[PDB]
Amino acid sequence: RGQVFDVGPRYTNLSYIGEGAYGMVCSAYDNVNKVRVAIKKISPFEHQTYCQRTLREIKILLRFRHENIIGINDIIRAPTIEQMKDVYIVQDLMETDLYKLLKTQHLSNDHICYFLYQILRGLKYIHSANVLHRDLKPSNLLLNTTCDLKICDFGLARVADPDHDHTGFLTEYVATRWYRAPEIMLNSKGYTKSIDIWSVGCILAEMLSNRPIFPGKHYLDQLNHILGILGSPSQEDLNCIINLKARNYLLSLPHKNKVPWNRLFPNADSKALDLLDKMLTFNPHKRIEVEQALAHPYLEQYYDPSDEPIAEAPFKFDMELDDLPKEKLKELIFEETARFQPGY
Ligand SMILES: O=C(NCc1ccccc1)c1cc(-c2n[nH]cc2-c2cccc(Cl)c2)c[nH]1
C-alpha cells in the first residue's frame, strides 16, 4: 500500500501498520511458519546517517537473543549490492507499543510492575553486551496480546564509553527529548549506562499517570522541567559538575524545592515511587543501576537472577562506522544481511 512493498513470495497479505523516516512497516503472512509477522522497509542508502542507524541496528539485533528484545527473523534484499535500493527487516509481530496504550488505557499497578520488570530484564541484557540503547521510550516498547514486552529500535544504540563521556554545556543531542537525562544538557555525551536508567524512570513515571513526566518544548526547557520536580541539585551533586558554564547555570537558578512523588502520584504504589526516585536521581553516579533496579522490593514477585540472562559476549569497542562514507556502509549493510539470502 502507498508505495512499493516488495517482500517476495514468502510473505503475503500486506497490511499497513505505520512508518516514519527512512522506513515503513506492514504486517504479512509467513508461508514457511504460517504465522503473521511484521516487516519494515528501509531506504537508507541516500545519506550516511540513515545507513549508520541501519547498520548498528542490524548488527546488534542480529547478535542479541533475548525475550524482551525484538529480534530479526529474516532480512530480504536484492542479490547484488548494485541492485539493492531497499532492505526489508522481518521481526516479531506485536499487537501494539506502549505509546498507544498510554493514550487510552489506564494501567494497573500489576501491569505497571510487570511492564517495568520486562523493560529492566531486557535492559540488563543490553548493558551486559556493553551496549546503550540511548532512545528508550514508550513507542520503542512493543507489547503483544498477552502483554509480553520487547524493546525495539537500536538505531541510536552505541557501545558504552564512560571514559570519553564528558563534553561542554548545552551540547546538541539526537535522542528523544522528554527522556534525555539532566547531564545530557550539562556535560554528558550519552556514553554511560546511566543514560538508559533515567529514561526507564521517565517511562515508569509516565506509566503511573499516562502523562510524560518531563515534557520540555525545547532543548533547555527539558532541564527546567526536571529541575522543577527534583528541585535544586545539592552541593555535592553540584561539585561533580566540573564544567564551569554548566555549574554556573545551575547556580544562577533560584532555589527550588523537590516535589514529593506521592504529591504527583497519589494512588501510586509506595515501593514503585521509591524505585522511581532511585531511577530519576539527578546525580548519574548515584543513579540506581539496572541490576539493582531488578533486586528492588517493587519487582520482588518477578525478580530471579537465574532467569535474567546476560550477553554471551559484548562489543569490544565503539563501532568505527562514525565517520565512514555512504559507500562503505552500504557494502557493510550488504555483508551483514548475507546469511538470509538463499544462495548462502
Ligand atoms: O523497528 C521497529 N520500529 C522502530 C522504527 C524505526 C524507524 C522507522 C520505523 C520503525 C519495529 C516495530 C515492529 C512492530 N512489530 N509489531 C508491531 C510493530 C509496530 C508497532 C507500532 C508502529 C510500528 Cl511502525 C510498528 C517491528 N519492527
Swiss-Prot record:
Q: Supply one GO molecular-function term.
A: phosphotyrosine residue binding
Q: What class of enzyme is it?
A: transferase
What does the record give as the reaction this protein catalyses?
L-seryl-[protein] + ATP = O-phospho-L-seryl-[protein] + ADP + H(+); L-threonyl-[protein] + ATP = O-phospho-L-threonyl-[protein] + ADP + H(+)
Activity regulation description: Phosphorylated by MAP2K1/MEK1 and MAP2K2/MEK2 on Thr-171 and Tyr-173 in response to external stimuli like insulin or NGF. Both phosphorylations are required for activity. This phosphorylation causes dramatic conformational changes, which enable full activation and interaction of MAPK1/ERK2 with its substrates. Phosphorylation on Ser-15 by SGK1 results in its activation by enhancing its interaction with MAP2K1/MEK1 and MAP2K2/MEK2. Dephosphorylated and inactivated by DUSP1, DUSP3, DUSP6 and DUSP9. Inactivated by pyrimidylpyrrole inhibitors.
Q: Which Pfam families does the UniProt entry name for this protein?
A: Pkinase
Give every Protein kinase domain span: 11-299
Its GO CC terms? azurophil granule lumen; caveola; centrosome; ciliary basal body; cilium; cytoplasm; cytoskeleton; cytosol
Modified positions (Phosphotyrosine) are 173
Tell me where it mainly resides.
Answer: cytoplasm
Task: According to the UniProt record, list the residues that bear Phosphothreonine.
Answer: 171, 176
> What processing steps or modifications follow its translation?
Phosphorylated upon KIT and FLT3 signaling. Dually phosphorylated on Thr-171 and Tyr-173, which activates the enzyme. Undergoes regulatory phosphorylation on additional residues such as Ser-232 and Ser-234 in the kinase insert domain (KID) These phosphorylations, which are probably mediated by more than one kinase, are important for binding of MAPK1/ERK2 to importin-7 (IPO7) and its nuclear translocation. In addition, autophosphorylation of Thr-176 was shown to affect the subcellular localization of MAPK1/ERK2 as well. Ligand-activated ALK induces tyrosine phosphorylation.
Positions contributing to ATP binding: 17-25, 40
- Reading the lineage from the top rank, the first entry is Eukaryota
Listed GO biological process terms: apoptotic process; B cell receptor signaling pathway; Bergmann glial cell differentiation; cardiac neural crest cell development involved in heart development; caveolin-mediated endocytosis; cell surface receptor signaling pathway; cellular response to amino acid starvation; cellular response to tumor necrosis factor
Q: Please report, in chain numbering, the residue ranges of the motif TXY.
A: 171-173
- State how it assembles: Binds both upstream activators and downstream substrates in multimolecular complexes. This interaction inhibits its tyrosine-kinase activity. Interacts with ADAM15, ARHGEF2, ARRB2, DAPK1 (via death domain), HSF4, IER3, IPO7, NISCH, SGK1, and isoform 1 of NEK2. Interacts (via phosphorylated form) with TPR (via C-terminal region and phosphorylated form); the interaction requires dimerization of MAPK1/ERK2 and increases following EGF stimulation. Interacts with MAP2K1. Interacts with DUSP6. (Microbial infection) Interacts with HIV-1 Nef through its SH3 domain.
Q: Which disease is it linked to?
A: Noonan syndrome 13: A form of Noonan syndrome, a disease characterized by short stature, facial dysmorphic features such as hypertelorism, a downward eyeslant and low-set posteriorly rotated ears, and a high incidence of congenital heart defects and hypertrophic cardiomyopathy. Other features can include a short neck with webbing or redundancy of skin, deafness, motor delay, variable intellectual deficits, multiple skeletal defects, cryptorchidism, and bleeding diathesis.
The entry's protein name is: Mitogen-activated protein kinase 1
